[PDB]
Amino acid sequence: PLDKINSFLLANRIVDDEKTFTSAPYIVAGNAERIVSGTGDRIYARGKFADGQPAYGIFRQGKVYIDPKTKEVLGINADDIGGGEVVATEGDVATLALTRTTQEVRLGDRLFPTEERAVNSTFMPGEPSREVKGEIIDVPRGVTQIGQFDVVTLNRGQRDGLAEGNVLAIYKVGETVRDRVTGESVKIPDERAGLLMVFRTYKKLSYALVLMASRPLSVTDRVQN
């Protein structure tokens, strides 16, 4: 059980509040050691973040567009470095060392403050509430039908239900066409083996490491139970 949690923990880079630092990005740059990633290497960056918080989380911006009438994207902040620490340089720039977590940090990337969140392996048994039902979108993978497990972003109405219920089963809705009668195609949900483990960041969507029991489901599919 702990190892499954460890895999998710390896996948736990996506955080909320893309809008905040879209409004105030901490700008990284530097050719003294011209890298787009490093472990303990020196990058420089401009912003008060140099003056303030020594650590920080490097996040690339994804967008989760739900509530089409409200047409809101609550984005995805993919955490690039595992961690980093700073030295202060004049000019409001900083020189930081980088503990890297598999994600290259674009030399011209956006930096955000460090926000440590505690995750436990106590989620492993599951918290299954069926009422929660919603679609899935915006996987970092971007690939439809991803299987075995993956970090998925459940939708917003689905997100509030998620606030109620952590665990749900997989459904892939497939359209069946009445080719020889009408040509009309009716989408039919197909319950798929495999369930999601969901960790919810309220005020954002739910970051869920879903374990797929064989069934490969499209980027958009019905998570329900």
Partner: protein
């Protein structure tokens, strides 16, 4: 000997551990090139650079 071999069998019949290896290649190319050609040509008095 049968029992000892059985224990060896128990040790040997162990699931081989698969690992997912993800090696990613990142290529970044930044190019800035500026060229200025300045020309002053007059054939009227034969002065042209």
């Amino acid at each position: 000997r049968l029992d000892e071999l059985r224990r060896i069998v128990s040790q040997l019949d162990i699931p081989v551990r698969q690992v997912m290896i993800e090696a990613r290649i990142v290529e970044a190319n930044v190019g800035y090139d500026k060229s200025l050609g300045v020309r002053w040509g007059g054939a009227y008095h034969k002065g042209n650079w």
